[PDB]
Amino acid sequence: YPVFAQQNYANPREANGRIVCANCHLAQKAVEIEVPQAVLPDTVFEAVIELPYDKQVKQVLANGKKGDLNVGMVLILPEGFELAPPDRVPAEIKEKVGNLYYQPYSPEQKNILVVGPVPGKKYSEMVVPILSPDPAKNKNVSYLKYPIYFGGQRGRGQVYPDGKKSNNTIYNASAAGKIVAITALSEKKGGFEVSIEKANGEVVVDKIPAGPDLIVKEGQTVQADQPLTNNPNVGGFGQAETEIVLQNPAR
Numbered sequence: 001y002p003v004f005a006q007q008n009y010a011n012p013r014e015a016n017g018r019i020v021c022a023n024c025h026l027a028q029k030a031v032e033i034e035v036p037q038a039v040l041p042d043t044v045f046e047a048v049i050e051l052p053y054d055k056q057v058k059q060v061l062a063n064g065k066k067g068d069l070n071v072g073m074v075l076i077l078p079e080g081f082e083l084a085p086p087d088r089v090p091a092e093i094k095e096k097v098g099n100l101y102y103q104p105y106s107p108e109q110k111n112i113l114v115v116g117p118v119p120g121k122k123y124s125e126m127v128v129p130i131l132s133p134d135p136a137k138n139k140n141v142s143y144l145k146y147p148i149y150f151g152g153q154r155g156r157g158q159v160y161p162d163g164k165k166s167n168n169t170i171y172n173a174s175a176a177g178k179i180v181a182i183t184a185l186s187e188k189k190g191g192f193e194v195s196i197e198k199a200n201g202e203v204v205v206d207k208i209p210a211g212p213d214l215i216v217k218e219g220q221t222v223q224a225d226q227p228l229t230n231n232p233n234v235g236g237f238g239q240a241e242t243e244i245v246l247q248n249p250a251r
């Protein structure tokens, strides 16, 4: 979630341009962003973002069942640019934005906006009202062509802040050996326990949460780190970059 990024990463964009959501949402899925080529100072403009995905395909949920996907994003604007205050956003734009609550990454980074999680069904496309700065009043900005960075996220991640894998990723054999048993946990918690007999006779038990499907069978020999399941992840994170020119009013 955006909060996972906020609580664990001071800056959402790394030196090489990678946005931190990618450290946990391990699958790539394209996104799109559009902003006007240019904007006058102290003016409200729209950033239209696209987070496409097949809405017919459900994902594995935290509870092990299948369900809809939720989305979120992080938008990195040039210093000085900020979310347009409600009083500056015309009715026609507020309607396009819908019931979304964009928030600054931190009180000290009002130029970085986030949103989510929100339903993918309704927000696979979003509009963000942005207010441009004024070089005449802000010396941290000038009349330049500035870059804008975007990260669009869909679906549950593969690893948590604590480093533990979620049930929405691949599970691998902890050791090489012969699978001597594949036990179904319960019927309410789901999941499995895969017993692997090593060459020395020791038996290790790999626990697999409900969600992923097994691709191995009893009696089958596996190598260390060999996948025991499929890759249930159907979501993805994508990045895009664009630009905008802050116009210099002439009179």
Ligand code: HEC
Pocket: 001, 002, 004, 005, 008, 012, 020, 021, 022, 023, 024, 025, 061, 062, 068, 069, 070, 071, 072, 073, 074, 114, 116, 117, 118, 151, 152, 153, 154, 155, 156, 157, 158, 159, 160, 161, 166
């Ligand atoms: C790892 C420390 C993470 C970072 C950094 C980010 N996300 Fe994440 N996200 C992560 C997990 C493991 C989960 C699943 C939680 C669960 O058990 O359900 C999520 C989930 C989301 C969601 C909800 C998706 C859904 O329910 O279908 C969204 C919209 C999402 N994450 C967005 C998001 C964005 C935009 C991030 C970067 C700014 C981001 N996440 C970082 C793990 C982590």
